[PDB]
Amino acid sequence: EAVVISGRKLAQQIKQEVRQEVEEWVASGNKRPHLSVILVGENPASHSYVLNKTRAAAVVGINSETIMKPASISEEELLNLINKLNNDDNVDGLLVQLPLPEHIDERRICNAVSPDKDVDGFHVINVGRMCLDQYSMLPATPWGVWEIIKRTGIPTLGKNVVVAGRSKNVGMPIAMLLHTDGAHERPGGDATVTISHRYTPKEQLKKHTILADIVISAAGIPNLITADMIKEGAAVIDVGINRVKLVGDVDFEGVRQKAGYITPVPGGVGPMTVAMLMKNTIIAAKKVL
Amino acid sequence: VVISGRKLAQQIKQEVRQEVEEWVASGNKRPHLSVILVGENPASHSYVLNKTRAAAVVGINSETIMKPASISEEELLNLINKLNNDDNVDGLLVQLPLPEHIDERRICNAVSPDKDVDGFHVINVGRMCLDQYSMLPATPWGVWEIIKRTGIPTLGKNVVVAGRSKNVGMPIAMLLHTDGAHERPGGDATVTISHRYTPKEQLKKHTILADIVISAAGIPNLITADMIKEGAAVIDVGINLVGDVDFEGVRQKAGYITPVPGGVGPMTVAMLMKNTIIAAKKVL
Numbered sequence: 001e002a003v004v005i006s007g008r009k010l011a012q013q014i015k016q017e018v019r020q021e022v023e024e025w026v027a028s029g030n031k032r033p034h035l036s037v038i039l040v041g042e043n044p045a046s047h048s049y050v051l052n053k054t055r056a057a058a059v060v061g062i063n064s065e066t067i068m069k070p071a072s073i074s075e076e077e078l079l080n081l082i083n084k085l086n087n088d089d090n091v092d093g094l095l096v097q098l099p100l101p102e103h104i105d106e107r108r109i110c111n112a113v114s115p116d117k118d119v120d121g122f123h124v125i126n127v128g129r130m131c132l133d134q135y136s137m138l139p140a141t142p143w144g145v146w147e148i149i150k151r152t153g154i155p156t157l158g159k160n161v162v163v164a165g166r167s168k169n170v171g172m173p174i175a176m177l178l179h180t181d182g183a184h185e186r187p188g189g190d191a192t193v194t195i196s197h198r199y200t201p202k203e204q205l206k207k208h209t210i211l212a213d214i215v216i217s218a219a220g221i222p223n224l225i226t227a228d229m230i231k232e233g234a235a236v237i238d239v240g241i242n243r244v245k246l247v248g249d250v251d252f253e254g255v256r257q258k259a260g261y262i263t264p265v266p267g268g269v270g271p272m273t274v275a276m277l278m279k280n281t282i283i284a285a286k287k288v289l
Numbered sequence: 290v291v292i293s294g295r296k297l298a299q300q301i302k303q304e305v306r307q308e309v310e311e312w313v314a315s316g317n318k319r320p321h322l323s324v325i326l327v328g329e330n331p332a333s334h335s336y337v338l339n340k341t342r343a344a345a346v347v348g349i350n351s352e353t354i355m356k357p358a359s360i361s362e363e364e365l366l367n368l369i370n371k372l373n374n375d376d377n378v379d380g381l382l383v384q385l386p387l388p389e390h391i392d393e394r395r396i397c398n399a400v401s402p403d404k405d406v407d408g409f410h411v412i413n414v415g416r417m418c419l420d421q422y423s424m425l426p427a428t429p430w431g432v433w434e435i436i437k438r439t440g441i442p443t444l445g446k447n448v449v450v451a452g453r454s455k456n457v458g459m460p461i462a463m464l465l466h467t468d469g470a471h472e473r474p475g476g477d478a479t480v481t482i483s484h485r486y487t488p489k490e491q492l493k494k495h496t497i498l499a500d501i502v503i504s505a506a507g508i509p510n511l512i513t514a515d516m517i518k519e520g521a522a523v524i525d526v527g528i529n530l531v532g533d534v535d536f537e538g539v540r541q542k543a544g545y546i547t548p549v550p551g552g553v554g555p556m557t558v559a560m561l562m563k564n565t566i567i568a569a570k571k572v573l
């Protein structure tokens with residue numbers, strides 16, 4: 001039977017590490033870190049996720065605020081608020097929760113966040129630097145996926161990995177992190193990585209997953225990964241959060257009988273996203289990059 | 290089938306020449322490409338001369354600025370900055386590899402992004418990885434053009450890329466797997482990235498499934514006929530006289546194959562001409 005990896009337990013540990021780092025930072029005479037989150041509209045999942053982020057901020061001793069705005073806000077109004085926060089020296093980290101309304105360009109918004117406060121790692125320079133394996137602010141969900149694998153001791157060098165999903169904020173960075181050189185400035189996982197997406201035929205997906213030592217599903221499709229697609233002992237990491245009750249992309253009970261490792265939904269990658277954001281916020285407050 | 294890289298590059302260069310003539314006939318400045326060349330790498334000199342020959346034939350003015358390998362990083366940076374501010378210069382590229390004492394990423398980032406016809410500037414790398422309009426690196430774009438103009442489908446197909454280098458293998462994988470509907474369209478293929486830590490047996494287990502194998506590793510005979518699915522397309526990006534592919538053997542198994550020389554090589558030069566007219570038009 002498969003080890004269920006508790007993302008909540010891993011994330012709680014990581015937050016204790018950040019809390020100690022923040023306390024030593026403040027005891028050293030530096031200002032306490034402050035995270036600003038901009039929430040637009042009333043997407044219920046977004047409100048939940050931001051509450052988890054502000055909760056975690058309090059846990060690790062980082063000050064925070066959520067600024068909520070109606071979905072009817074204009075792009076220029078969002079850009080003025082972002083510029084205000086860019087110029088407020090008390091704000092160390094700034095993020096705009098996604099998705100945004102159709103009349104607001106996410107890329108222009110993400111690029112307006114000052115790169116030193118870009119705790120999401122969504123600024124184009126951070127994206128470019130990450131794709132060149134340079135030191136960068138790593139996006140929270142891909143980094144939490146990598147940390148799950150690393151802290152569980154699951155090997156990646158020379159191994160076969162399939163990522164289902166190519167979204168720019170989740171699936172593409174996960175594939176970048178896992179396939180790149182371990183020796184570069186920002187090390188990668190040195191895996192052989194297959195990127196699948198909405199136009200991969202289900203039979204070809206299975207033909208690649210059955211070879212995989214790690215399967216990482218970030219598609220948002222319930223029961224996309226089933227026990228027959230997984231080789232025995234493989235690690236399966238479920239990034240999907242599908243409202244159907246919340247399920248992942250993985251047939252949890254089915255794959256649990258064949259995988260070596262498996263993360264649950266909820267309580268797997270989600271809390272890890274929040275913990276890695278805390279790590280990015282103390283990194284931003286320290287002006288390391 | 291043996292795809293002629295020379296013939297496709299000829300058509301692309303004719304398209305650029307017509308685009309350049311129309312642009313000049315409408316009263317605009319004639320585009321100008323500046324190439325900086327460091328040292329005496331015989332392949333680099335050969336490649337740069339190919340680039341400047343193609344520029345002339347498509348109506349793009351050019352100059353190669355050659356410096357000794359003993360040049361220092363700050364002196365290369367000075368030359369780049371003067372060229373960045375010379376309004377006659379539309380495109381600027383520094384031929385790689387540079388001498389070991391020069392940081393290539395610092396050099397690539399010093400070229401103004403609007404003149405960065407290589408697409409090596411971090412902002413151009415980032416825009417490419419986000420599927421935004423960008424100057425595409427010429428060799429990866431040449432690979433994609435070979436595939437598209439030969440009419441070889443990508444959407445839903447299995448593609449293996451052998452190599453992960455930031456200038457060639459990674460942009461190739463990026464172009465091929467991404468969404469046809471985005472600003473800069475992609476191939477919508479299922480892409481496997483292999484590299485120097487992919488065991489040989491694992492490479493074959495993936496190529497054997499591939500409708501398109503793209504080899505960009507620089508290893509002679511890395512791709513042999515047993516690894517190839519019958520009827521698949523094999524694109525040899527490696528340059529060794531010989532490519533990465535065992536050309537003679539794979540010729541009998543593949544439905545399409547690309548020779549070395551005269552394959553991807555001339556397409557790289559052709560795609561640079563496209564980027565140069567794009568740069569002159571200041572569309573980005």
Ligand SMILES: NC(=O)c1ccc[n+]([C@@H]2O[C@H](COP(=O)([O-])OP(=O)(O)OC[C@H]3O[C@@H](n4cnc5c(N)ncnc54)[C@H](O)[C@@H]3O)[C@@H](O)[C@H]2O)c1
Nearest residue numbers: 141164165166167170197198219220239240241269270273
């Ligand atoms: N911390 C977390 O757990 C976390 C963080 C972010 C997102 N997510 C979840 O990830 C899922 C998607 O996230 P996103 O923001 O990347 O979504 P998105 O809608 O932007 O991307 C979905 C991706 O899935 C791919 N896909 C669709 N059908 C597929 C198929 N049949 N096979 C393979 N790939 C297929 C698409 O092509 C696309 O790349 C959702 O469940 C979302 O909640 C979870």
Ligand SMILES: NC(=O)c1ccc[n+]([C@@H]2O[C@H](COP(=O)([O-])OP(=O)(O)OC[C@H]3O[C@@H](n4cnc5c(N)ncnc54)[C@H](O)[C@@H]3O)[C@@H](O)[C@H]2O)c1
Nearest residue numbers: 428451452453454457483484485505506507526527528529
């Ligand atoms: N630079 C160009 O514009 C250009 C243009 C046309 C062709 N090429 C050719 O293609 C190559 C381009 O890559 P580069 O010059 O950046 O090379 P590089 O030395 O930076 O790396 C080549 C890649 O090959 C991979 N690789 C090594 N051994 C492998 C193996 N056994 N199996 C699978 N992958 C393996 C490596 O991990 C690496 O990603 C060159 O060697 C050249 O021959 C280059």
Ligand SMILES: Nc1nc(N)c(NC(=O)Nc2ccc(C(=O)N[C@@H](CCC(=O)O)C(=O)O)cc2Cl)c(=O)[nH]1
Nearest residue numbers: 048049052095096097098140266267268270271273
């Ligand atoms: N700017 C920006 N915009 C974004 N959208 C993101 N992504 C993001 O926040 N992801 C995210 C974060 C936390 C959770 C979480 O707490 N999950 C719990 C269940 C809670 C529940 O479902 O109620 C669980 O998994 O157990 C889940 C997700 Cl998807 C970002 O990082 N930056």
Ligand SMILES: Nc1nc(N)c(NC(=O)Nc2ccc(C(=O)N[C@@H](CCC(=O)O)C(=O)O)cc2Cl)c(=O)[nH]1
Nearest residue numbers: 335336339383384385407528550551552554555557
């Ligand atoms: N800044 C920067 N630096 C770089 N090094 C590159 N890459 C690059 O120039 N590649 C490149 C370009 C042309 C050829 C070519 O003409 N090939 C002929 C054979 C000619 C012969 O062998 O003499 C053939 O294959 O038929 C071959 C290659 Cl590898 C770049 O794009 N930008």
